[PDB]
Paper text:
The MaPgb* structure can be considered as an expanded version of the 3/3 helical sandwich typical of “classical” globins (i.e. Mb), with an additional N-terminal extension, built by a 20-residue loop, followed by the Z-helix, which precedes the globin-fold conserved A-helix. Residues belonging to the Z-helix contribute to formation of the Pgb homodimer, which is centered on the intermolecular four-helix bundle built by the G- and H-helices of the two subunits. Thus, in Pgb the access of diatomic ligands, such as O2, CO, and NO, to the haem is granted by two orthogonal apolar tunnels that reach the haem distal region from entry sites at the B/G and B/E helix interfaces.
As a result of such increased accessibility, the tunnel 2 entrance site (i.e. roughly the cavity left by the Tyr→Ala mutation) in the Tyr(61)B10Ala mutant hosts a glycerol molecule (in both chains A and B; the glycerol molecule bound to chain A is modeled in a double conformation) which is able to H-bond the haem-Fe(III)-bound cyanide (distance of ∼2.8–2.9 Å, depending on the protein chain). Thus, in the Tyr(61)B10Ala mutant, the haem-Fe(III)-bound cyanide molecule is stabilized by the interaction with the Trp(60)B9 Nε2 atom (2.92 Å for chain A, and 2.90 Å for chain B), and by the additional H-bond provided by the glycerol molecule which mimics the H-bond provided by the Tyr(61)B10 OH group in the MaPgb*(III)-cyanide structure. Furthermore, the presence of the Trp(60)B9 side chain within the haem distal site affects the orientation of the haem-Fe(III)-bound cyanide, but does not impact on the ability of the adjacent Tyr(61)B10 residue to reorient its side chain toward the haem-Fe(III)-bound-ligand, as demonstrated by the structure of the cyanide-bound Trp(60)B9Ala mutant. Similarly, the Tyr(61)B10Ala mutation does neither impair the Phe(93)E11 ligand-sensing mechanism described above, nor ligand stabilization provided by Trp(60)B9. Higher accessibility to the haem-distal ligand-binding site due to the Tyr(61)B10Ala and Trp(60)B9Ala mutations may also partly contribute for the increase in koff for cyanide. off for cyanide dissociation from Trp(60)B9Ala MaPgb*(III)-cyanide and Tyr(61)B10Ala MaPgb*(III)-cyanide species are closely similar to those reported for cyanide dissociation from Mb(III)-cyanide and Hb(III)-cyanide complexes, where ligand stabilization is achieved through the distal HisE7 residue.
Residue numbers in the entry:
A (entry chain B): 5 to 195
B (entry chain A): 4 to 195
Amino acid sequence: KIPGYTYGETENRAPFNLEDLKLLKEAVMFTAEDEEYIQKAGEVLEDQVEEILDTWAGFVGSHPHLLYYFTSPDGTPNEKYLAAVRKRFSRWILDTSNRSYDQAWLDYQYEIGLRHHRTKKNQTDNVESVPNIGYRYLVAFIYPITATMKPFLARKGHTPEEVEKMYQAWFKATTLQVALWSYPYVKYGDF
Amino acid sequence: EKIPGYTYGETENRAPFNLEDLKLLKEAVMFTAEDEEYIQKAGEVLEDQVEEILDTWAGFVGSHPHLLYYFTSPDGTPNEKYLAAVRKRFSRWILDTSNRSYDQAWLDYQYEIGLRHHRTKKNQTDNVESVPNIGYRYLVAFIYPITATMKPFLARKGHTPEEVEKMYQAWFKATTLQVALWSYPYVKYGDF
Ligand code: HEM
Ligand code: HEM
Ligand SMILES: [C-]#N
Ligand SMILES: [C-]#N
């Protein structure tokens, strides 16, 4: 198993539904063309995940105010926390590429938002760490997530056109997800 | 000659986020002095194309009833006065993003723009009757179509793909940065 990974088995139903999802996909310009290319992105990234995770960890770890969110109260990084999240983040790369974007997917998107937010942060791994990840950084991270993926998307010999389409699909899907993850952060009724 | 409703540098509130917050947020979006240079270049490329850009942007918003919704009168039809007034301020925002120093005045206006999408100030600037709040989910979503809209225009002055990529990436970073700041009035106090 992947510890803490509970896709399909969340305690809550998401507060957004399939119509909300359709409308949000429209807002990020996501179509059947992106369904095709996000799946291809999975195929390309799957065997590169260790290097992708090393790069992502390098980014977070190089900024004290970001590594902060994985620290124990004494200010030192909690390596068990980092390692447990790494395994779930690795799986998220595959889920983004392979899962149907349906009710189960929406339920887990609500869960991931809850886990960055004070509602559930630190509970999954039973760690003691900072209580909340400020929302400002969830939005900001859309950029470095896409920048991290981009070079890896070129490494299986796909055409420049195909690489660009995979990258754009990844950007749309990341944006879509972060928008959903805002739910527990947003003043009730303003989402 | 004054753009109605455009109050850059003269807003009523100091932003709740400061220049140190901004430094740290720039780090999170990988925005550096290099991007300052490339966003200025993007400005130079985009400036004389703004009418086409605005038509393209309006076309996207107008293409989906649930998006055009945010500019509608109670009868469900677009408020053309509202669209036209916002268009002029959006045109200016393209230039500001490219040309202003991201300093305290800039931060203060980012708080203002957030407040104007939010129920706090929406519809007050133009004194219109429209929908009370733009759901935050769409502000985040729109990071994508903003970048997709700018991309082809960034290539229309003969720059190489490598140069267009640097301008595009700078625009993407700067748009993300701004939407992150605009979340402030939407986010539960203490969670931003
Ligand atoms: C585009 C934005 C982001 C993406 C795509 C992302 C991705 C993920 C994923 C896939 C997980 C595991 C979800 C699961 O439990 O199955 C996770 C958890 C986590 N992320 Fe992020 N993340 C983002 C923003 C952030 C930011 C800004 C930080 C600040 C460093 C951060 C730090 C963490 C932490 C500390 C956890 C563990 C939360 C917990 O205690 O459950 N993430 N993230
Ligand atoms: C990346 C996201 C967005 C960007 C860059 C953007 C840009 C802008 C700008 C520059 C303005 C004028 C600011 C000023 O008053 O000086 C504005 C206002 C406005 N925008 Fe957006 N916008 C975004 C998201 C959205 C969304 C999702 C909608 C929904 C259709 C929307 C609809 C509106 C409306 C209705 C106004 C007028 C608000 C008021 O009553 O003052 N915007 N936007
Ligand atoms: C999150 N990493
Ligand atoms: C906003 N348009």
